[PDB]
Design a protein around this ligand. Structure first.
Ligand SMILES: COc1ccc2cc([C@H](C)C(=O)O)ccc2c1
Ligand SMILES: CCCCCCCCCC(=O)O
Ligand SMILES: CCCCCCCCCC(=O)O
Ligand SMILES: CCCCCCCCCC(=O)O
Ligand SMILES: CCCCCCCCCC(=O)O
Ligand SMILES: CCCCCCCCCC(=O)O
Ligand SMILES: CCCCCCCCCC(=O)O
Lengths: 55, 574
């Protein structure tokens, strides 16, 4: 049974990966990287970073 | 809120801090105005602390500061204080002086310094704190405080020794140098951040944090990069509070996540808030995980290389920098940067070619030359340094750079060469693992110091051509300079090769400087001399300052044997 912390982190990752998919990122390479994040903040900083670079 | 800071800081620290603060905004007020001003801010605390319900106690430190910071006769920074706090403080800050117009502060004699320090510590230390504070208005206040605590230690120590001088001077010198360079490095980042925006800055931090936290995942490092870019961006505005709050938060965040980030952060994370971001910024690199694969899979051999890079270029590049950097704490950041630049160019040059893979298959080969360049450069110089001492090494450099750019002013050649040499002793101690990164650190500032000195006094085509290059190519450019074969000898001037007993009494450091000054002048008057020839002279010259200075009759020794030495050197050269 997940901690609230573990639940939030898992969510943020799915969230962020969908949100990247909807912007046009297709590569496991980025989703993997999102997946190795340990913190929700890490999840969103890197999502943000991937979006800025997609332009 | 101000009670928060006082119990947290502990009178001494709070007071030291506030003094510094005023000194950096009010650069021109005398020490005694600030002392009581600190007092009229303290001793409101420790009571405003006891009574939390008191008046103005809850207002922002900016408010409490800026309202204090509007009490006193003298004044176009006047337009300020009309505004009603933030929506105001962009005011004071916008007028601060790059470098202010006040007495180039000369150091007292040892005897004196130690005297004033034993007769009273508080005043002599705070005095000097205010003083340094005002000439360095962008100098993060806590870092300055840490130096002040290092100053007390050095004074406490050397003022009770046989050698008061041989002890303290070297420490003041080493402190001064760290300070100045700490400051120069702040400016450097800030300026660079303006000239090249966030992107170059981020690339830098990515490289740096990856070396330092090799176990952290990309997302951890990237996160730290974002937060750090923020911190420097705010700290580059110039406001302690905005800067400090961001630093303290970033530090808190690293510590909460230390187990993931680095096994080297136990001590730092259990330090008081004041010191924690400081202790972090200088933690040793962690050990990299044990079985890192080659970077070939993901960055060369993979089929998806171009799909991936196109989808988010800067991040792909960041991940490459990340993977390279954490595997190479031996490299300098600028080297890693050169490597990523190359990689980048290559992906650009062929993810649009008929066979992408065909081009980039060989890309790591392109890194050997680049790694090899500084590597070799360190070997020969540290080798050369190892043959000769710090002193003679400095002289080798004096000769090398005077031959390269004689147009430069002797004082500058002496300072840079002396510093370049100092750099050698600080860095060659370390093994071939730690050397390049240590060189970069010390070298960039020494180099910029030269550049700044050169900016406000152009003299050489090739030097400014080097100073306005990318930070990545700055040192390579400097290293590409050739001996100036075109340069015509300076004319003799006797006064410059004549010495007096006075040198026997100078600081050893000050003595060396005098000899080194003459050496540069020598090269400038005989640019063709062989350094086989220079040896002979340098050797006659040392024997000259040995014969005199140990001789009963010194004025005459230096004088008519100065003749002996000159004619002996005028002959044998030209
Ligand atoms: C952080 O400690 C410092 C920083 C800068 C300094 C500058 C100087 C003087 C003005 C100098 O020689 O230029 C002295 C001591 C200093 C200590
Ligand atoms: C915070 C105490 C500072 C002590 C000042 C040291 C004097 C050295 C002056 C100089 O480096 O040219
Ligand atoms: C406003 C109180 C003085 C600034 C706060 C003390 C410095 C710690 C912040 C940091 O980690 O860099
Ligand atoms: C000192 C080299 C660059 C900083 C690396 C360490 C990160 C410290 C973050 C901070 O507290 O500001
Ligand atoms: C100086 C050329 C190196 C390019 C590296 C790109 C830096 C951005 C990394 C990131 O956004 O996380
Ligand atoms: C006087 C010693 C010169 C050695 C060169 C130092 C290399 C710095 C790292 C770099 O720019 O890539
Ligand atoms: C006028 C002084 C020139 C600065 C020396 C440049 C340092 C780079 C090391 C080297 O290649 O020698």
């Amino acid at each position: 049974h997940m901690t609230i912390d573990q639940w939030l982190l898992k969510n943020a990752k799915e969230d962020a990966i969908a949100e990247l998919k909807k912007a046009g990122i297709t590569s496991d390479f980025y989703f993997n990287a999102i997946n190795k994040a340990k913190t929700v903040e890490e999840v969103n900083a890197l999502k943000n970073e991937i979006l800025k670079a997609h332009a | 809120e101000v009670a928060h800071r006082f119990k947290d800081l502990g009178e001494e620290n709070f007071k030291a801090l506030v003094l510094i603060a005023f000194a950096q905004y009010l650069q021109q007020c005398p020490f005694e105005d600030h002392v009581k001003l600190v007092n009229e801010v303290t001793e409101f605390a420790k009571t405003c602390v006891a009574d939390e319900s008191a008046e103005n106690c809850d207002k922002s430190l900016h408010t409490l500061f800026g309202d204090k910071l509007c009490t006193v006769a003298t004044l176009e920074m006047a337009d300020c204080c009309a505004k009603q706090e933030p929506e105001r403080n962009e005011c004071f800050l916008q007028h601060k002086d790059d470098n202010p117009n006040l007495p180039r502060l000369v150091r007292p004699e040892v005897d004196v310094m130690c005297t004033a320090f034993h007769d009273n510590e508080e005043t002599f230390l705070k005095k000097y704190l205010y003083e340094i504070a005002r000439r360095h208005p962008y100098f993060y206040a806590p870092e300055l405080l840490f130096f002040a605590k290092r100053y007390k230690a050095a004074f406490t120590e050397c003022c009770q020794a046989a050698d008061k001088a041989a002890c303290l001077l070297p420490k003041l010198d080493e402190l001064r140098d760290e300070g100045k360079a700490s400051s120069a490095k702040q400016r450097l980042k800030c300026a660079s951040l303006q000239k090249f925006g966030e992107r170059a800055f981020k690339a830098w931090a990515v490289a740096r944090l990856s070396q330092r936290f090799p176990k952290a995942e990309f997302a951890e490092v990237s996160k730290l990069v974002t937060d750090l870019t923020k911190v420097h961006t705010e700290c580059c505005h110039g406001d302690l509070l905005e800067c400090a709050d961001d630093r303290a938060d970033l530090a808190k965040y690293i510590c909460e996540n230390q187990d993931s980030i680095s096994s080297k952060l136990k001590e730092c994370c259990e330090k008081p808030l004041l010191e924690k971001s400081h202790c972090i910024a200088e933690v040793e690199n962690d050990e990299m995980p044990a079985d890192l694969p080659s970077l070939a899979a993901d960055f060369v051999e993979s089929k998806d290389v171009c799909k991936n890079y196109a989808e988010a270029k800067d991040v792909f590049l960041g991940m490459f920098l990340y993977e390279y950097a954490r595997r190479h704490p031996d490299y300098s950041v600028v080297l890693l940067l050169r490597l990523a630049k190359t990689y980048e160019t290559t992906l650009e040059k062929c993810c649009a070619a008929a066979d992408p893979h065909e081009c980039y298959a060989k890309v790591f080969d392109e890194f050997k030359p680049l790694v090899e360049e500084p590597q070799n450069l360190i070997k020969q110089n540290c080798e050369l340094f190892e043959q000769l001492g710090e002193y003679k090494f400095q002289n080798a450099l004096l000769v090398r750079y005077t031959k390269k750019v004689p147009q430069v002013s002797t004082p500058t050649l002496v300072e840079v060469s002396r510093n370049l040499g100092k750099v050698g002793s600080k860095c060659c101690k370390h093994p071939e693992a730690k050397r390049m990164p240590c060189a970069e650190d010390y070298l960039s500032v020494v180099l910029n110091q030269l550049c700044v000195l050169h900016e406000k006094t152009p003299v050489s085509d090739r030097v400014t051509k080097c100073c306005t290059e990318s930070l990545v190519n700055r040192r390579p450019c400097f290293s590409a300079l050739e001996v100036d074969e075109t340069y015509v000898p300076k004319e003799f001037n006797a006064e410059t090769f004549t010495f007096h007993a006075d040198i026997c009494t100078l600081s050893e450091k000050e003595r060396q400087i005098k000899k080194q000054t003459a050496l540069v002048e020598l090269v400038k008057h005989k640019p063709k001399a062989t350094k086989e020839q220079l040896k002979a002279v340098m050797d006659d010259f040392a024997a000259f300052v040995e014969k005199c200075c140990k001789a009963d009759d010194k004025e005459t020794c230096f004088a008519e044997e100065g003749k002996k030495l000159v004619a002996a050197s005028q002959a044998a050269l030209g």
